[PDB]
Amino acid sequence: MNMDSMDLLGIDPKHVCINTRDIPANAGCFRYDNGNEEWRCLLGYKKNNNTCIEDSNPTCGNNNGGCDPTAGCQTAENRENSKKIICTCKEPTPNAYYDGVFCG
Known part of the structure; x- marks a missing residue:
């Protein structure tokens, strides 16, 4: 009874x-009305056997x-303080969803 609005x-x-x-x-599961399904794993997690595991060597x-x-994936070393992976948030949207995987 509603449309997409995040x-x-x-x-x-x-x-939800x-x-x-x-x-x-x-990982974030997105199922669209058209039947499309997207799954977005979180940063620092690697794809292992269709599963998301925290990897010590996250390229x-x-x-x-x-x-x-x-969204942009940026890899840094000197910024490992925030994480090994620094993802680029979207346009001015102070609502970070799915742990920053999607902004706005």
């Missing part, structure tokens, strides 16, 4: 993803770091 919601999980057994832990951990397709 730009500052804060509402009850009416548009279902408890999935297909998507591994520490962005995922092709795009697990970040949204339009």
Whole structure:
């Protein structure tokens, strides 16, 4: 009874993803109305046997770091304080969802 709107919601999980057994832990599951399904692993997590594990050698951990397709994955060493992987948040959107995997 509603459409896509993630730009500052804060509402009850009416548009939340279902408890999935297909998507591994520490990953975001997005199921679209058209039937499309996206799964975004978190930063620092590597793809191991269709599962997301925290990897000691995360070369962005995922092709795009697990970040949204339009988010930028940046790898640094001197910034390991914030993490080994620094993902580029999206346009001015102070609402970071999925641990920063998606902004706004």
